[PDB]
Amino acid sequence: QFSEQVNYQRALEGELARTIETLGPVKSARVHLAMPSPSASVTVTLEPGRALDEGQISAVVHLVSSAVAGLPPGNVTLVDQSGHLLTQSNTSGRDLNDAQLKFANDVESRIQRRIEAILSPIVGNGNVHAQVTAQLDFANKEQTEEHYSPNGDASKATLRSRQLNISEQVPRSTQRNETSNYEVDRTIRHTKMNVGDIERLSVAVVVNYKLPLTADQMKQIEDLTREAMGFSDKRGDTLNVVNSPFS
Amino acid sequence: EGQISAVVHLVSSAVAGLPPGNVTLVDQSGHLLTQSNTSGRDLNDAQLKFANDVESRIQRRIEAILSPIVGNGNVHAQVTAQLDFANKEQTEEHYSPNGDASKATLRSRQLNISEQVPRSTQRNETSNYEVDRTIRH
Amino acid sequence: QFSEQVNYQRALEGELARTIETLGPVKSARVHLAMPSPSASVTVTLEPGRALDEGQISAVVHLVSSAVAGLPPGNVTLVDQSGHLLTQSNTSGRDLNDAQLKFANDVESRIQRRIEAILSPIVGNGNVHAQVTAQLDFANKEQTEEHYSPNGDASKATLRSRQLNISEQVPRSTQRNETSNYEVDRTIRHTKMNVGDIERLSVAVVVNYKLPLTADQMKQIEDLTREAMGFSDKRGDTLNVVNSPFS
Amino acid sequence: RDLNDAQLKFANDVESRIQRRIEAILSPIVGNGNVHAQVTAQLDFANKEQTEEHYSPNGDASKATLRSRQLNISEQVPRSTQRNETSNYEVDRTIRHTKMNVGDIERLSVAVVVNYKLPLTADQMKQIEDLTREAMGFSDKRGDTLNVVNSPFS
Amino acid sequence: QFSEQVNYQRALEGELARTIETLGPVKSARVHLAMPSPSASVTVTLEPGRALDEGQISAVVHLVSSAVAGLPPGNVTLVDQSGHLLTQSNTSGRDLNDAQLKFANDVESRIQRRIEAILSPIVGNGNVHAQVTAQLDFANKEQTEEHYSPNGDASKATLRSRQLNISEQVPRSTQRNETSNYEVDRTIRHTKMNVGDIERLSVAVVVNYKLPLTADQMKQIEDLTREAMGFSDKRGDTLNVVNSPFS
C-alpha cells in the first residue's frame, strides 16, 4: 500500500519532468516531490547559451505547482545546471518586496511613457526626457464608519413609543413625565483600501532647445505634463520642467 | 498578438543571455507592445493592465472623434484615470420622521384623561407607532 | 483501489490532451491533473508561427475546467513551448472587471450605430461621426422599502379593539380613559436593482460640410440624436453636436 | 542572518533605482558621463499594526442621537422644582485598522557631483538641484537631504 | 514494513545525489537523510579547481530541503571534499553571534564603497580612503502603545449614557446628581522593531594632496560624505575627514 503511493509519485516526477523538457530553453529537467504540506525541486538544465527570463520562471513554477495536489507556488524550487537558485520561496525573508519595487517601477514607467508620448509630437522625437518618482503605499488598511443621523430636533425624529404623563393642579403643582424610544438612521460604510494606490508623485522633465523655447511655450508644455501626470495637489504632487540644451 | 513574439524572440535569441522578458517593443505611436508583468505582485499589475484599458479606450475615442476634423495624423491624446479599487460596502437604514401627528402611524394608544373642580387635571398617554423603514444595501 | 482512481486519471489526462491537439493552433498538448480543491496544467505546443489570442486562452481553459469535476477555471494553468505562462487567473483578481469594459463598450457601440444609422440618410453615408461615453453602474444595490399609512385621522383609522371608559360626576369631576389597537396599511416594496444600468451618457457628433449647414438644419439634427441617445435631463446626459469640414 | 541580510539586497535595490533615475535625468543636460550620484536610504523594516477607534463628540444636543430619553419634570409653587433626565445615546464610530508596510523609505540622502563644462552657472546649478529634488521624491517631512556640488573630474 | 520506508529512503538519497551531480561544479554528491524533525547531509565533491559561491550553496540546500518532506533549509549540511562545512545551520556556538559580525561588516562595506564611489571622481581614482564603524542593534524588541484621547472637555466628550437628576427647594436645599458613561477613542500601535538597524555611524575619510586642498574644496567633500553616509545627528553620528599626503 505504501509502495502504491510511491510507485505513483515516482511516475508523476517522471511525467512532470517530461513536459518541462518540451519547453524550449530547457534541455532536461529533473523534479522531486515532497508530498507528506508539499514541495518540489525542479533542476532544469537549460540549452547551451540560454537563460530563463523573469516570467519564464513562473512558467516552470506554475507548471509544477498546479500539476501537484496542494502545492503552492511558494514551495517550488527551480535550479539551473550552474547552481543559481532561480526561485525566491527558498529565500522567503520577504521575497515580496522585490515585487513592491518592480510594481512601483511599472506605475512610473507608464506615467513616463505617457509624458514622452504627449510631448514627442510638440518638441520632436527625442528632445524630451522625463523621470517619474511615485510613492506607493502598501499598508493593508481597513475601515468601518457608522453614522447616525442626529434626531435632536423633534420634527425630524422617528419615535417608536412615547409615554407622556402631564399632571397638574391649582399652588400650581405641575408635573410632566415623558419617556421615549427613538429609532435612528444608521449608515454603515465598510471600506477595505487598495494595496498599491499612488500617494505622491514627483515628475522631472527636461526639454531640448530649439535655441531657447518661448516662455509661454514652456507654460503650455508644463500644462500638458500636469495632465499626463494626473497632477493633484491634494496628494501633494510636484512637477518641475526645465528647458536646457542637450549633449 | 503572435506577431509580437516574432520580433521579441528575433532579438531575445540573437543576443547572448537575453530572456524574452527584457525585450521592449514600441511602435511609432508610443504603444508599448510588450509587457513587464511580475509573479509576486500578481494582483496589482492587473490593476494596471485594467487601468490601461480604461485609458486606452478614452484615448481611441478622442483620436477617433477628432481625426475626422483635423486629419488622421494631426492629433494625439493621453488619458490618466485615477481609478478606485477599494472593496467597499454600505448599509443605509433610513426612517421617516413621525413627529407630525397628521402623518404618524399609531399601533396602540392609551389616552387616560381626568379633571376635577382647583382645576386638578391630568393627562396620561402612551403610544406605539409603526415606522417607515428603507434599507439600502 | 488506489490504482483504480489513478489508472483513470492517467486516461483523462490522455483524453483531455487529445482534444486540445485537435484545436487548430495547438500541435501537441500535455495536461496533468491534481485531483485530491483540484488543478490542472496544460502545456500546449503551438504550431510553427502561431500564438493563442486573449479569447483563445479561455477556450483551452474552459475545455479543461469543465471536463474535470470541481475544477474552477482559476486553477487551470496554460503554458506554451516557450515558457510564457498564459493563464492570468493565478491572480483571480480582475477577470471580471475586464468584462465591465466589454459590456460598457457594447452599450456605447449600440447608441453609436443608432445615431449613425439615423443621421446617415440626412447628411450622407460617411458625412457623420459619433462617439458615446456611458458611465455605467455596477453596484450590486438592493433595497427594502416598507411604507405604512397615516392613521392619525379617525375618518380613516382601522380599529381592531377599543375600550372607552367615560366617567363624570357633576365640581365637574369628569374622567375619560381610552385604549385602542389599530390595524395598519403596510406596503413592502423590495427592489434588487440591476447591474449595468446607465447612469449618464455623453455623445459627441460631428457632421461634414456640404458649405456649412443651416441653423435649423442643425437644430433638428440635434433633436434627432437627442432621441437616438435616450436623452434625459434626469441623468444629466450631455450632447454636443458640431459642424465642421472633414478631410 | 539569512532573513536579515535580505534587507541589504532590498535597500540596495531602492538606492540603485533612485540612482539610475538621477543619472538618467541629468545625463541629457550635463552629458553622458559628467554626473555621478549616490543615494542613501534609511528604510523601516519594523512590523507595525495600528487600530484607531475614533468616536464623534455628541456633547451638543443639536448633533446627538438619542436612543431613549426619560425626562421627568416635577414642579411645585417655595418653588420645589425637579428634573430627572436619563438619556441613552447612539455614537458614531470609525474603526481604522492599518498594517504598515515593511520596507518603506524613512529618509533619503543624495549626493550629486557634476563635472565642469569651467564652472557651471549658478542658475544652471539651481535647475540641476531642482531636477534632482524631483527624481528623489524629496519630502521635507521625511527629513530628506540633497547635496549637489560642482567640481572638475579626473 | 520497516524495510519499506528504508528501501525507499535509500532510493531518495540515491536520486537526490544524482541531480546534485548534474549541477556543474559538483563532480559527485553523497547525501544521507535523517527522517524520523528531519535532516540531511550533502557531501559534494567539487570539480578540480572550483568552489561553490555564496549563492551556489543555497542552490544545493534548497535542492534538498524541498525534495524531502518537512525538511527546513536550516537542517541541511553541505560539506566539500576538503572538510569545509559550507552551511551555517550547524555551528552551535556563534552561528547567529558571528553572523552579527558578517552582517555588520556588510553595512560598513557598502557605506565604504559608496563614499569611495562618490569621491573618486573629484579627488581622483585612488586618492581617498574611508573606513566605517556601525554600532548596530540586535536587541529583539517589541512594543505596544495604547493611547486614549482625553475626554475631559465636554465639547469633545462622547457620552454613551447620561443620567442627570436635579432638585431644589426654596433654605435653598438644592441638589445635583449626574452619572455618565463615555466612549473613548483608543489607538493601539504594536511595533516589532527591526533586528539589525543602525544605532550610530562613525566614518573616517582621508584624502591625498594635489599641494594641499583648500577650505571649500575640503568643506564640500565633507558635505558629500555627510550625505553618502546618511549622517543624522539624531543618531549622534561622527564624521572626520582629514587631508594628508599619501605614501
Swiss-Prot record, chain B:
The subcellular localization recorded is: Cell inner membrane; Bacterial flagellum basal body
Q: What induces it?
A: Inhibited in nutrient-poor medium.
> Where does the source fall among the domains of life?
Bacteria
Bias regions of kind Polar residues — which residues? 118-129
What do we know about how this protein assembles, alone or with others?
A: The basal body constitutes a major portion of the flagellar organelle and consists of four rings (L,P,S, and M) mounted on a central rod. The M ring is integral to the inner membrane of the cell and may be connected to the flagellar rod via the S ring. The S (supramembrane ring) lies just distal to the M ring. The L and P rings lie in the outer membrane and the periplasmic space, respectively.
Assigned protein family: Belongs to the FliF family.
- What this chain does, per the record? The M ring may be actively involved in energy transduction.
Protein name per UniProt: Flagellar M-ring protein
UniProtKB/Swiss-Prot annotation, chain D:
Question: Which regions are flagged for Polar residues bias?
Answer: 78-89
Instruction: Give the induction note.
Output: Inhibited in nutrient-poor medium.
Where does it live in the cell?
Cell inner membrane; Bacterial flagellum basal body
Q: Which family does it belong to?
A: Belongs to the FliF family.
Q: How does it assemble?
A: The basal body constitutes a major portion of the flagellar organelle and consists of four rings (L,P,S, and M) mounted on a central rod. The M ring is integral to the inner membrane of the cell and may be connected to the flagellar rod via the S ring. The S (supramembrane ring) lies just distal to the M ring. The L and P rings lie in the outer membrane and the periplasmic space, respectively.
User: So what does this one do?
Assistant: The M ring may be actively involved in energy transduction.
User: What is the designated name of this protein?
Assistant: Flagellar M-ring protein
